[PDB]
Amino acid sequence: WRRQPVRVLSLFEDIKKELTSLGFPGQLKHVVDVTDTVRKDVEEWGPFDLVYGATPPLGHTCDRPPSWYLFQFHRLLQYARPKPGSPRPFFWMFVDNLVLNKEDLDVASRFLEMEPVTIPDVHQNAVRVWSNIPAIRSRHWALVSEEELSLLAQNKQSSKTKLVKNCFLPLREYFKYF
Amino acid sequence: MFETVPVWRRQPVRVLSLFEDIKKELTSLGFLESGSQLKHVVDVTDTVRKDVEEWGPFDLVYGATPPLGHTCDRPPSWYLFQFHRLLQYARPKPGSPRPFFWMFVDNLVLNKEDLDVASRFLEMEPVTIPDVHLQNAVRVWSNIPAIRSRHWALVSEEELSLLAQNKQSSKWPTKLVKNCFLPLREYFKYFST
Amino acid sequence: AEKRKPIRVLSLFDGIATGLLVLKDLGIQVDRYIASEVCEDSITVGMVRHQGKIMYVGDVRSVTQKHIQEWGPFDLVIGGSPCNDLSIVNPARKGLYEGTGRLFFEFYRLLHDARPKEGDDRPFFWLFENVVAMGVSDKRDISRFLESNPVMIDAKEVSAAHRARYFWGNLPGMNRPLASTVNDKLELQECLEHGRIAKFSKVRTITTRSNSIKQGKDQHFPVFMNEKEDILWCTEMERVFGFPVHYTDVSNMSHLARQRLLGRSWSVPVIRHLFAPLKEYFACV
Amino acid sequence: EKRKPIRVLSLFDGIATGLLVLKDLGIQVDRYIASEVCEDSITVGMVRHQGKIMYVGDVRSVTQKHIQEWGPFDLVIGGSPCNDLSIVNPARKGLYEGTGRLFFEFYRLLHDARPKEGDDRPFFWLFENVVAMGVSDKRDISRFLESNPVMIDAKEVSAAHRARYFWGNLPGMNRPLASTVNDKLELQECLEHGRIAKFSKVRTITTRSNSIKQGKDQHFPVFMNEKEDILWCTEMERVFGFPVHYTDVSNMSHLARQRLLGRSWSVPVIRHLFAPLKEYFACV
DNA sequence: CATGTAGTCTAATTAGACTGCATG
DNA sequence: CATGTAGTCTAATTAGACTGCATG
Ligand SMILES: Nc1ncnc2c1ncn2[C@@H]1O[C@H](CSCC[C@H](N)C(=O)O)[C@@H](O)[C@H]1O
Ligand SMILES: Nc1ncnc2c1ncn2[C@@H]1O[C@H](CSCC[C@H](N)C(=O)O)[C@@H](O)[C@H]1O
């Protein structure tokens, strides 16, 4: 009803070009590389209430194994979580541009407490998000079969985003709009 | 020490002969009387110690393996072990001072391994006795001093195998082997004429 | 006052149950020892030698947070992830983020779940072990995710073998100096079966591979027996590691199967040194 | 007055079962001279008895002169190999060839060790072999030892069938064998924790792994968490009566250890035959 | 620069059929 | 009638001698 501006932490990913175009002295925190960030460094930066991370898309620009991004994401997410004495809302958001394999996917859903949802793009390109936000978990979306998802990944790996814009919309009502 | 005593107190030899009879050879050199006490047994399998003792005391125990032929129904080592067994049955108690002799003769049928279990069980190495122009040979184990001391013609082992190879390939020992029983004459009564 | 209570233990990658063996010999009462392990040889050793006290819960990746919250609360959380993909002795190591290396994060995951979080100041202790001979970058990542720096403890100081290892944890007195004792076999000669002569006082680090007995790169045997040199027997390795002799003589295992279990486990007197301060916190017999 | 410690000659000693039984009956042992050539056998005895056993190698190397200097002996024990006597071997060579003739080495050294006639001192001996031998092989052993054997089956004081022949002169060799309160008569009592036995008694344990299997059809005698399994070395030691882990030496595999147990004596059987000896020689 | 909670490869050992039949 | 202090065969599977180099 009466809301405050949002404070977003983002890893592995430049988000501000898509954030404020959805309607949000900048309150973003982007960290160059998180092998060296410790607990107090994360909370020395302002208390966030939506942490965000993601893997790079399907391009040969990987100094990391694919699961390095989630493990580091899971680590700093626990740093930014507020104690149960926090009355404001809090969410998180990690997603993979289909870099992870089946063995990496099972580990992802074990560490993130959630089964991911797949979003497609009608034209294609698809994307795989875990996050506690209640809207996308219950959002009516056109489902895809999982062998067509990597029949389309093999076709996208041979030739080697507004898809996230539809998902970040439900954060409208919890934080001041522009 | 097998001492010799004067002539009048020597007694007729009492012979236990196993696997082969040597009655026709002993009296040929006069060890028994003409006509009708040597004890000969072929199959010694169920011979017990009591049997031997009631068979009178013995002065000479003799055994021989069958000559090279078809006559060896038993394994060749059987003749030695059974000989050792019965020999200990026939020994007198270490009190009496009479002369007691024993002898085992091999007609070239025991192989290298059986020869070594032979000398281990009789506690002496064998002597080889030849015949001359190399007709025959025998290996002899015995406590008769004149056998283990006589200097027989040397016979290496490459010749004894050739003799046994064609003796078994073509087929009773000689009469020159009086030197096998000749040393016993001085100890027992001599019968001739 | 308030009497102390029996300790409740979550053991990850339990192996041949070194942790429970040490707690019992320190006289600490154990109410429950819940172990995650998958090697059937490992489990058979633990079931037999502790007579069915251990609760085996299987693959560490099947243990969920709700299981942790109901099986608990836990007072002690111990583990030592596989090192075959971290130790530089393997030139085909897959690093920390792939292979059996990533199993470390399962320990990190469950350690966070068993923690008494904000508000609860009940005593809580944890211990994670791994090798020193790992990559520089993999060492810093383990300590970043565990938010603590390792203490290096070598079993050469309280046993007859070299074994340099890293220990992360919050056990009281972890850096406290290592102290020889009456029951510690410091010399190889005290570890040999009767009639065998030790060449040296120490052996090199024992691993699962049978070349660990040999004293050097130039191949070697540490024992004299009769008229020939000889290898160290697996029964003598048990005494070098500090285990009761014939501890791993179970289920017709070969000496290589048994050396495979020993060469992976903890050195008992090192663990005994680290667990000993827990006697003040929990009920003892 | 004064009993003296026992002086023992043990031919084909194996894993030193005789010495083990003498110690646990409490009989002080002066000398224990053992003939043996299996290096795994020699290692067990050397380790398990801390160097008390004097090993002298091949029984065929032992002369009467050796028995004179090593002696005198109060007890002579042995059990020569049976792999050329037992009918289970279709290729057996009999008593007079192969390893069968090693029996005569026992008969030989037994004679070499007997006290000279005129001596009254106690002298005991014991020879064991298998029941499942040819009828004429049994006859020839009895005529060379001048004794008939007693058949003792370990199934009356142990968890395993093991019918063996025993020649000797120990006091009361033929007396009824009674189980004592320390015998484990059923397979369950010899298993490690958490394991359940199907059968109460196992058939004869030989060196071969098939012998654990029950019947013509293979059969596993133990249940472990609803799964069938075979016996472990540890459990086989307790079936035989040895201390658990007695053969856990020299990195021996489970087949190598079974090879040693499969050739040895049932301990509670030997315990019953040696028990009247503690009146003849010094106690603990 | 000696060391190592390993892995890879190929002579060696081991599970599992079979063989055998005298003996009580 | 089943059993047996074994032995001979194989596949299957281990067991012992090699490669590899980052690190303190
Ligand atoms: N996925 C998994 N879940 C549970 N345990 C596992 C596992 N993968 C491997 N392990 C076990 O983890 C152990 C690591 S070695 C640690 C042994 C233990 N510290 C001891 O003292 O004995 C190995 O025994 C291995 O069998
Ligand atoms: N020539 C020889 N000299 C001495 N021992 C021999 C031998 N040939 C075989 N042996 C040994 O004789 C043993 C026969 S089995 C007897 C084992 C013994 N009764 C026990 O209780 O363990 C075997 O261990 C074998 O190694």
Residue numbers in the entry:
A (entry chain C): 185 to 208, 215 to 313, 318 to 354, 361 to 378
B (entry chain B): 178 to 213, 217 to 313, 317 to 354, 359 to 380
C (entry chain D): 628 to 912
D (entry chain A): 629 to 912
What does the paper say about this structure?
Mammalian DNA methylation is established by de novo DNA methyltransferases DNMT3A and DNMT3B4, and subsequently subjected to maintenance by DNA methyltransferase DNMT1 in a replication-dependent manner. DNMT3A-mediated DNA methylation is further regulated by DNMT3-like protein (DNMT3L) during gametogenesis and embryogenesis. Among these, mutation of DNMT3A has been identified in ~25% acute myeloid leukemia (AML) patients, which gives rise to aberrant DNA methylation patterns and increased cell proliferation, and correlates with poor clinical outcome. To gain further insights into the context-dependent DNA methylation by DNMT3A and the mutational effect of R882H, we determined the crystal structure of wild-type DNMT3A (DNMT3AWT)–DNMT3L tetramer in complex with a CGA motif-containing DNA, as well as R882H-mutated DNMT3A (DNMT3AR882H)–DNMT3L tetramer in complex with CGA- and CGT-containing DNAs.
To address this question, we determined a 2.45 Å-resolution crystal structure of DNMT3AR882H–DNMT3L tetramer in complex with SAH and a 25-mer DNA duplex containing two separate ZpApG sites, mimic of two CpApG sites. Structural alignment of the entire DNMT3AR882H–DNMT3L–CAG DNA (DNMT3AR882H–CAG) complex with the DNMT3AR882H–CGT and DNMT3AR882H–CGA complexes gives an RMSD of 0.40 Å and 0.41 Å over 845 an 827 aligned Cα atoms, respectively, highlighting their structural similarity. In particular, the catalytic loop in the DNMT3AR882H–DNMT3L–CAG DNA complex is well aligned with the corresponding region in the CGT and CGA DNA complexes, with residue V716 moving into the DNA cavity vacated by the base flipping of zebularine to stack against the ZpA adenosine (A6). Nevertheless, due to the different base ring sizes, A6 in the CAG complex engages less van der Waals contact with the catalytic loop residues (V716 and P718) than the corresponding G6 in the CGA and CGT complexes, which may contribute to the reduced methylation efficiency of DNMT3A on CpA over CpG. Accordingly, the protein–DNA contact at the RD interface of the DNMT3AR882H–CAG complex leads to a buried surface area of ~207 Å2, comparable with that in the DNMT3AR882H–CGT and DNMT3AR882H–CGA DNA complexes. Similar to what was observed for the DNMT3AR882H–CGA complex, the side chain of R836 points toward the +1 – +2 flanking nucleotides, albeit with two alternative conformations: one R836 conformer approaches the O4 atom of T8 for hydrogen bond formation, while the other points toward the backbone phosphate of G7 to form a salt bridge. However, unlike the DNMT3AR882H–CGA DNA complex in which N838 forms base-specific hydrogen bond with CpG guanine, the equivalent residue in the DNMT3AR882H–CAG complex is not involved in any contact with DNA.
